[PDB]
């Protein structure tokens, strides 16, 4: 939690905490998933001294807890990152990100001739884990690509 060192450092109140977030994907989550848009005090810690685990990003989401659904959503951008529920200045629940079935509206069907590109619809793909390498099936065009492909978009 607290990247303490030798001075006064601030913590939160009752919120979800995500650490050991592969450095550089915190902002992405922040942007992408859009948890940034709130009147609740957030605190972030990009590029942190994880010494052995190099660096990490970190999102101390105050007064807010994430549904184990959302938690899962992390997986491709911050899989090993932990989301600990901290109530009353303490980890009531250490939570780890599992892989879901469907990925809602943060992804982009690389299919140019799709319809999802031009319209008022929210991206949805089916995650079919294969030999621990992912394939993502667009719910519209019915084309299936890999995770690496749709992650460049």
């Amino acid at each position: 939690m607290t990247h303490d060192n030798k001075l006064q450092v601030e913590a939160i109140k009752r919120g979800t905490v995500i650490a050991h977030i592969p450095a550089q994907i915190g902002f992405k989550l922040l942007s992408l998933f859009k948890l940034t848009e709130t009147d609740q005090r957030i605190t972030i810690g990009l590029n942190l001294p994880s010494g052995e685990m190099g660096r990490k990003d970190l999102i101390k989401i105050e007064n807010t807890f994430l549904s184990e659904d959302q938690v899962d959503q992390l997986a491709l951008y911050a899989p090993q990152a932990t989301v600990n529920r901290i109530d009353n200045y303490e980890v009531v629940g250490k939570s780890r990100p599992s892989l879901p079935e469907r990925i809602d509206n943060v992804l982009v069907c690389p299919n140019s001739n799709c319809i999802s590109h031009a319209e008022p619809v929210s991206s949805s793909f089916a995650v079919r884990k294969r030999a621990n390498d992912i394939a993502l099936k667009c719910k519209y065009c019915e084309k299936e690509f890999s995770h690496n492909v749709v992650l460049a978009n």
Binding site: N113, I115, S116, A118, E119, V121, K139, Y140, K143
Partner: protein, 310 residues
Amino acid sequence: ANPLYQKHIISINDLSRDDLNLVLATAAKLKANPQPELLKHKVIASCFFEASTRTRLSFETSMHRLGASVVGFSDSANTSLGKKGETLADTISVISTYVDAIVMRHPQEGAARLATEFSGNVPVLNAGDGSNQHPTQTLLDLFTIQETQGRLDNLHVAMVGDLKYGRTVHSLTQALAKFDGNRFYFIAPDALAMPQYILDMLDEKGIAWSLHSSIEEVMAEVDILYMTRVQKERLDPSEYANVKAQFVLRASDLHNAKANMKVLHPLPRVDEIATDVDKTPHAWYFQQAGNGIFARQALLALVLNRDLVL
């Protein structure tokens, strides 16, 4: 209510063997005894955003056969609104108010799926989305195949031509690998092989599919020779010529085939299927071609109608 009542008919994958079998059973009944006022009073818009004349004259001929009224459009000549500017969303939204159902065809893939979202609760049936789906064909495909060997299992279906891109060999494969013991032989150019993912799901069932260089490499051991068209664009003309006759089926080649072997092909053929073939008893295309009127009727019947007391 009948299983497919009020349902959406979008992708073949989305119909189970029990399903296909209902519509298959139904269309068949229909074939014999018509109900020319079954969908009377009902109105269906035809929305052929990418005009396919015969397919339209087919949905429309089915529409009129149960006495159903029809409104609609086709090949937006050039700049018809609901194209640029106007999103197909807002355009499904509006028709969903006037009409009792919607059959459409479209250039981009998934279009139908999307349509389903703003469709309201008015049935939509994809009749051509992108290089994705075209269920209705598949139905009149097996309604035809079943009509020739009273079974969708124990079959050795030959699927020649451009397997790779053709959007109907993949589904028909799909459909057929839902019934048992289906042996699929694949006659195709190196440059136009099957699209693997079809293969993998095929092996996943553990279905048989011996790849073939020539039709005479199966010619004897076959029932439904399904022949599709290869297209110029997707292959240099010299290469087109290179092969040309490599996959064209002549009637002489039919001196080998079984009694009940029937050659099918969605249409149109042109360079692929010769006319001597037209006359020989294995020619059935124009028959699968008129059969779809009944596979079409059915789908329309089961969807707009509650109980199918045929």
